[PDB]
mmCIF file of C-alpha atoms in Angstrom:
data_model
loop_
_atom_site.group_PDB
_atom_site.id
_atom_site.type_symbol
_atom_site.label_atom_id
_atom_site.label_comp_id
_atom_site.label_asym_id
_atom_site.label_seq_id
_atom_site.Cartn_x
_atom_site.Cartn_y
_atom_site.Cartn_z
ATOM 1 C CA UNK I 1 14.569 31.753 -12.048
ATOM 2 C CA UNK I 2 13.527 29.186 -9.353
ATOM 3 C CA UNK I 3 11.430 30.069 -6.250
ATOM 4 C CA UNK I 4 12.518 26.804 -3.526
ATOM 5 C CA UNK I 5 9.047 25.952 -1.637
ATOM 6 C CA UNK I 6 9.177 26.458 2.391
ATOM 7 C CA UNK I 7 10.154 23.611 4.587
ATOM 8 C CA UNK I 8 7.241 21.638 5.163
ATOM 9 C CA UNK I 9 5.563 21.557 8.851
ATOM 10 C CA UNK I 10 5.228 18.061 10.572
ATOM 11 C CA UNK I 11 2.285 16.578 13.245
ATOM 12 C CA UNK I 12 2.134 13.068 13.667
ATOM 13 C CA UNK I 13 -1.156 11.324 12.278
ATOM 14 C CA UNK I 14 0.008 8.099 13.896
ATOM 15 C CA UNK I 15 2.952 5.809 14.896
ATOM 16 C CA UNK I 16 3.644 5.348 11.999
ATOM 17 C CA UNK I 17 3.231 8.292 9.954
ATOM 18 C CA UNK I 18 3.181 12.079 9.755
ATOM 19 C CA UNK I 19 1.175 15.019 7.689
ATOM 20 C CA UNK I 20 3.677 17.654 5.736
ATOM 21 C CA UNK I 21 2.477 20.790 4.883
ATOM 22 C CA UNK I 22 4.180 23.938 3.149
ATOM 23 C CA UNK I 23 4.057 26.469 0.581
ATOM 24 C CA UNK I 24 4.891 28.558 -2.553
ATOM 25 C CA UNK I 25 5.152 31.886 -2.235
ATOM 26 C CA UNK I 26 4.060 33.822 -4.491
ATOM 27 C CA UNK I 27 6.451 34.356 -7.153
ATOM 28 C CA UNK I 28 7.396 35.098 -11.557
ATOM 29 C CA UNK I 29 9.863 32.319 -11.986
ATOM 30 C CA UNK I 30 9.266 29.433 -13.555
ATOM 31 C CA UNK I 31 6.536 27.296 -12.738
ATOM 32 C CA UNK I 32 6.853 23.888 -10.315
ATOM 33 C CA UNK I 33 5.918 20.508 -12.396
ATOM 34 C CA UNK I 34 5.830 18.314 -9.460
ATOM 35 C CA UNK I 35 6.774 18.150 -5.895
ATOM 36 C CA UNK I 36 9.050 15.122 -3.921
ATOM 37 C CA UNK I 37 8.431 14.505 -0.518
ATOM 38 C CA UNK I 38 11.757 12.949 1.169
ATOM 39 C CA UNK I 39 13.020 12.576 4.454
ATOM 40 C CA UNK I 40 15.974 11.267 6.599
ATOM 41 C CA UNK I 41 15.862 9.845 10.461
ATOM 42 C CA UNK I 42 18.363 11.753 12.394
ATOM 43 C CA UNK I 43 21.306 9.881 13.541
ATOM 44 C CA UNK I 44 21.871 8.194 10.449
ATOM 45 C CA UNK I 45 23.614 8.549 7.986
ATOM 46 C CA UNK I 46 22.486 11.855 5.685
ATOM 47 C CA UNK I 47 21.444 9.907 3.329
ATOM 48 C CA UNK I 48 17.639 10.903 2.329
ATOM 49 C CA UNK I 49 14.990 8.704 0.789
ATOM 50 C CA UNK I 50 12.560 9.770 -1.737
ATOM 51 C CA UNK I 51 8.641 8.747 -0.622
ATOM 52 C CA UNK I 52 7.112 7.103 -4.494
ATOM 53 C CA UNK I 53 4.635 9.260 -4.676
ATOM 54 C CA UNK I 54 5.507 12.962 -7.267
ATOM 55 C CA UNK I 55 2.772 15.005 -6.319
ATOM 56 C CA UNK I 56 1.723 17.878 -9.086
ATOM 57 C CA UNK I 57 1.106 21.204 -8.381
ATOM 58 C CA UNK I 58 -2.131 21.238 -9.623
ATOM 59 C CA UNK I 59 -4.646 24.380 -9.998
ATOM 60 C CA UNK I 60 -5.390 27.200 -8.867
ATOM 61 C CA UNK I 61 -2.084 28.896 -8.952
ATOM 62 C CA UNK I 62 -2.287 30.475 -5.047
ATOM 63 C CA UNK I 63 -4.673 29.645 -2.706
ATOM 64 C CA UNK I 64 -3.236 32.671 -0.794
ATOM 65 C CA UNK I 65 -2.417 35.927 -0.838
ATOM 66 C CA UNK I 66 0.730 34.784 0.558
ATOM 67 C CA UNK I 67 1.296 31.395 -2.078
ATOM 68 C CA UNK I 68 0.263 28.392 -2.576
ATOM 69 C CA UNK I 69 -0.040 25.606 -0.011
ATOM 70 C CA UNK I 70 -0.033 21.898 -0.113
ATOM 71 C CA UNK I 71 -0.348 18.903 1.869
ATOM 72 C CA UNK I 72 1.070 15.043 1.548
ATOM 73 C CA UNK I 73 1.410 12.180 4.351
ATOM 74 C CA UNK I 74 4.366 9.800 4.754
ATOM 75 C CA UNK I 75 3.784 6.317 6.224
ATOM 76 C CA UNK I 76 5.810 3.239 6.829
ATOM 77 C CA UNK I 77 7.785 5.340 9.716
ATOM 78 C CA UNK I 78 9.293 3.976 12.567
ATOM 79 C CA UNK I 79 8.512 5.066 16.089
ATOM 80 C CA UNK I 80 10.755 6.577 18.879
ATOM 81 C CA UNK I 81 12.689 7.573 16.018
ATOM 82 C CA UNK I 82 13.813 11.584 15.190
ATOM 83 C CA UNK I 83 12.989 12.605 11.106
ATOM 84 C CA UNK I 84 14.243 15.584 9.024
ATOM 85 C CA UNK I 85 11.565 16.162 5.742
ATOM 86 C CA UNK I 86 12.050 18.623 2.856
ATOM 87 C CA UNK I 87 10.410 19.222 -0.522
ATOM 88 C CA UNK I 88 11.792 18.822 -3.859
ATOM 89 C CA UNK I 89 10.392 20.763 -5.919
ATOM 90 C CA UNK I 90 11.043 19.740 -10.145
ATOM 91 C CA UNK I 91 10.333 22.594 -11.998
ATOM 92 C CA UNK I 92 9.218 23.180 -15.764
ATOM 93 C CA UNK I 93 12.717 23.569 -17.216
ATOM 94 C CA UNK I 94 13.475 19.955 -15.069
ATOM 95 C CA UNK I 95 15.881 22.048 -12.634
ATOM 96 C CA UNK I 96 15.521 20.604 -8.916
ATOM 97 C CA UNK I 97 15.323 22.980 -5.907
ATOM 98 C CA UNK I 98 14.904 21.123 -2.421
ATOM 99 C CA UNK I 99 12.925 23.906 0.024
ATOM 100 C CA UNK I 100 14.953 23.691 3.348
ATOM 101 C CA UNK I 101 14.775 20.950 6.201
ATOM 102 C CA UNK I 102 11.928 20.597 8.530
ATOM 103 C CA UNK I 103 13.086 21.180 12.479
ATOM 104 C CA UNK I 104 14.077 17.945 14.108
ATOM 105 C CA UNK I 105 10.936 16.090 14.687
ATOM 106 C CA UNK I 106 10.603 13.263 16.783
ATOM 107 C CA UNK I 107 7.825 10.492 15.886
ATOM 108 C CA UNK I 108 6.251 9.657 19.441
ATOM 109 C CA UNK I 109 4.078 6.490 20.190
ATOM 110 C CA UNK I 110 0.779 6.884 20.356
ATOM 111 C CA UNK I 111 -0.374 5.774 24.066
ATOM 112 C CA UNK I 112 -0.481 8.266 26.920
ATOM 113 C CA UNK I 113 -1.721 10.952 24.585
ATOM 114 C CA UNK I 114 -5.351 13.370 24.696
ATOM 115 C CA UNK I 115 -7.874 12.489 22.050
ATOM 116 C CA UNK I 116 -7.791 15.139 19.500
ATOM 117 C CA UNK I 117 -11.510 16.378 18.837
ATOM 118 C CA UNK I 118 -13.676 14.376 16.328
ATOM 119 C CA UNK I 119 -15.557 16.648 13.688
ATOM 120 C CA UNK I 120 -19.197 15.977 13.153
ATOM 121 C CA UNK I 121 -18.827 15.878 8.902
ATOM 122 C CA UNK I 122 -21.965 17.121 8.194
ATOM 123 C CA UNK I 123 -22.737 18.173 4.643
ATOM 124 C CA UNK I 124 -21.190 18.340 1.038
ATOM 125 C CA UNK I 125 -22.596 21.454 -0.481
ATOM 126 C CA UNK I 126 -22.466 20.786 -4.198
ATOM 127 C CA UNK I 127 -21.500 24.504 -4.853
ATOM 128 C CA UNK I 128 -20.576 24.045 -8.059
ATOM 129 C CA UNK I 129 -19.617 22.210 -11.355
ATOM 130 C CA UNK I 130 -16.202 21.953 -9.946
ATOM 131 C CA UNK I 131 -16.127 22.675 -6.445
ATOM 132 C CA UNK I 132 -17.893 21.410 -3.046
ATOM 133 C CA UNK I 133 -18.022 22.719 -0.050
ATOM 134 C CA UNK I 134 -17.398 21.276 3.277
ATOM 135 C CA UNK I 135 -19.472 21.744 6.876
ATOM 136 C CA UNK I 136 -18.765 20.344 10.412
ATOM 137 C CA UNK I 137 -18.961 21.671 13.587
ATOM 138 C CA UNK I 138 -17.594 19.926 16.998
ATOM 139 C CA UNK I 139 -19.479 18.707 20.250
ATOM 140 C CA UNK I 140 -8.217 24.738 20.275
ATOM 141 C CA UNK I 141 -6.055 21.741 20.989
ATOM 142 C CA UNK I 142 -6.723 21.983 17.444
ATOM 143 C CA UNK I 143 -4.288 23.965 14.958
ATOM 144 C CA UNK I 144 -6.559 23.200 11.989
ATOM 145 C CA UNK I 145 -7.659 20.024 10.469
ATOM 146 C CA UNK I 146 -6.860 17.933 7.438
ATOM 147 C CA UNK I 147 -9.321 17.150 4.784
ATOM 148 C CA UNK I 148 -9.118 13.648 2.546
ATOM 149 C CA UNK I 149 -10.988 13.098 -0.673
ATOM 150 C CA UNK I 150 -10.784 10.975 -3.572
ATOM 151 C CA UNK I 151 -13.294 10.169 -6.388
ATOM 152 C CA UNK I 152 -15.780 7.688 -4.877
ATOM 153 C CA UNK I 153 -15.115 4.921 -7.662
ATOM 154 C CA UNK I 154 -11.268 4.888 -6.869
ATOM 155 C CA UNK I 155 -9.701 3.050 -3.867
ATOM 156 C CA UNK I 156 -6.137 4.180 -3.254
ATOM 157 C CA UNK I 157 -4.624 7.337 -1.804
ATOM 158 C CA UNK I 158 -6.656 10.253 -0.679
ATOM 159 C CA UNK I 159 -5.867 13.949 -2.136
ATOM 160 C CA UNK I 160 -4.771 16.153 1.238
ATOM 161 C CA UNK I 161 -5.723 19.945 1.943
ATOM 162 C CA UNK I 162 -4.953 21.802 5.123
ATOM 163 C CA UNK I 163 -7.609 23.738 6.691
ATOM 164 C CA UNK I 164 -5.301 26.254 9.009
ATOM 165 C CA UNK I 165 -7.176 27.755 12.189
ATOM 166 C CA UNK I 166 -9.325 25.432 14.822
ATOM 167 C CA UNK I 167 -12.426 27.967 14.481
ATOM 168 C CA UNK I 168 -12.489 27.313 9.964
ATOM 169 C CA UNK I 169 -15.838 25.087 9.589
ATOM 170 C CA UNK I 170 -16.123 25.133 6.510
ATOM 171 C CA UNK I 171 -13.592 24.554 3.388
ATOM 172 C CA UNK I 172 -14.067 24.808 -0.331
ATOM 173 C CA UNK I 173 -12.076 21.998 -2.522
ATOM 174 C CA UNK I 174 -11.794 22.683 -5.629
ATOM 175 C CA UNK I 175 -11.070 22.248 -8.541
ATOM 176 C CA UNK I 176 -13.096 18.916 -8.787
ATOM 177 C CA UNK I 177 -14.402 16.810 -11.820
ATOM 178 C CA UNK I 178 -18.180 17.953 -13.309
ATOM 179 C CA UNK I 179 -20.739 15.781 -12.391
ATOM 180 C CA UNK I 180 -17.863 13.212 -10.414
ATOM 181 C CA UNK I 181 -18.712 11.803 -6.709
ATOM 182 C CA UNK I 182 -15.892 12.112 -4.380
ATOM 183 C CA UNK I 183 -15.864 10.411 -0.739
ATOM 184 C CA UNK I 184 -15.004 13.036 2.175
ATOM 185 C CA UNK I 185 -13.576 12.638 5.626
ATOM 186 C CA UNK I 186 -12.225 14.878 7.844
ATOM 187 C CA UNK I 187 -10.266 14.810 10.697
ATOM 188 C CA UNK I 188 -8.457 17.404 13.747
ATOM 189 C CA UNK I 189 -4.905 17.905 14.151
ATOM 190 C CA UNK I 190 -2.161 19.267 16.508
ATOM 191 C CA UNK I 191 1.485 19.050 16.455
ATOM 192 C CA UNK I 192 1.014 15.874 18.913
ATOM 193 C CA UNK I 193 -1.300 14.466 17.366
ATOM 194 C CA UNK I 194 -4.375 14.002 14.734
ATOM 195 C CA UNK I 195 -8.049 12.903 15.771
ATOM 196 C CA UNK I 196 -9.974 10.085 14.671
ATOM 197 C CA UNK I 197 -11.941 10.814 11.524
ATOM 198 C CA UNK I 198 -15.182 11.808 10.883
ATOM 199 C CA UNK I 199 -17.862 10.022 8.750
ATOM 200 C CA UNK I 200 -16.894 9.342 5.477
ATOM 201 C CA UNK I 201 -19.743 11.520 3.224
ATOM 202 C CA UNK I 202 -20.289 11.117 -0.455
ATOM 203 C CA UNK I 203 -20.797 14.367 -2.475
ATOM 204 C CA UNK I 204 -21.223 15.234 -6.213
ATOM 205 C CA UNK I 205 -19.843 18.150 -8.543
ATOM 206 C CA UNK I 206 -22.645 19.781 -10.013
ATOM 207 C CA UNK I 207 -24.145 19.209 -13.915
ATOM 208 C CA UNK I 208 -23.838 22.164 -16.518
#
C-alpha cells in the first residue's frame, strides 16, 4: 500500500517565499520515488500549481524514530496574499498520494518585524567520508533553524534540512559525496519569520 506524507509546516523566509517541512512516517508500503511541492492562494480558484522542482527521497530511510523528514522552499510568492501547500508524493509503482493541506497561511511583508537571531557558523567537522558535521552557537524566538548546502563547484539551488529545537547546535548532513567540498550556511527561523544567514563555510567529505 501507500503511506500519504504529513502536511507540510510553513514560516515565511521572505516576502516572497516560504520554507515547507514534513514527514514520512514510518511505514512497509511501498517506497516514495519523488516528492511535488504545490500550492494554491486562498480565494482563488482551487486550482493548485505544481513548483518545477521533483525532489527525491533520498537516503537514509528515517531520520527518526518517528519517519523521515524533509525540507523544500517555494519562491516567486506574492505578498499580503493567504497560501494552502501540500505534498505529492509519486511512489515506486507511479501511484500519486497528495499528504493533506497545510493550515491557511498568510504570507506577511517583511517590515515591522523582530530580527530573527543570526548563527555564528563556526566549523565543518569533516566527520566522515560521507558526512560533516555542523557547529554554531549564538551571541527561543527560534523554533529551529534551516541548514543550506550544495557542492561548492555547483551554483544553483541549495539542498534544505530542518534542524527542529532552538537549543540543537550542532547537525550532521549526511549522506555526502567522498572527498566532495560543499558550501554551508545556516540560518534561524520562526513561524514569522527566518534570520539573516550566517557565513557561508566551505567543508570537505573525508578521503578513504
Amino acid at each position: 500500500s501507500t503511506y500519504p506524507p504529513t502536511p507540510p509546516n510553513v514560516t515565511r523566509l521572505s516576502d516572497e517565499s516560504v520554507m515547507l517541512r514534513w514527514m514520512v512516517p514510518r511505514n512497509d508500503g511501498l517506497p516514495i520515488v519523488i516528492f511535488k511541492v504545490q500550492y494554491r492562494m486562498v480565494g482563488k480558484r482551487k486550482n493548485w500549481q505544481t513548483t518545477n522542482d521533483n525532489i527525491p527521497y533520498g537516503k537514509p530511510k528515517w531520520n527518526s524514530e518517528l519517519g523521515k523528514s524533509f525540507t523544500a522552499s517555494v519562491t516567486d510568492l506574492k505578498p499580503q496574499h493567504t497560501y494552502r501547500f501540500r505534498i505529492l508524493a509519486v511512489y515506486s509503482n507511479n501511484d500519486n498520494k497528495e499528504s493533506n493541506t497545510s493550515a491557511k497561511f498568510y504570507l506577511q511583508p517583511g517590515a515591522a518585524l523582530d530580527p530573527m537571531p543570526v548563527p555564528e557558523l563556526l566549523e565543518i567537522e569533516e566527520y566522515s567520508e560521507t558526512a560533516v558535521v555542523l557547529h554554531w552557537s549564538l551571541a527561543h524566538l527560534i523554533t529551529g533553524y534551516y541548514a543550506y548546502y550544495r557542492p561548492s563547484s555547483s551554483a544553483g539551488e541549495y539542498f534544505k534540512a530542518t534542524i527542529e529545537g532552538a537549543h540543537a547546535r550542532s547537525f550532521k548532513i549526511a549522506p555526502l559525496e567522498t572527498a566532495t567540498m560543499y558550501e554551508f550556511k545556516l540560518q534561524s527561523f520562526s513561524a514569522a519569520s527566518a534570520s539573516e544567514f550566517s557565513a557561508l563555510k566551505q567543508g570537505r567529505t573525508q578521503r578513504p
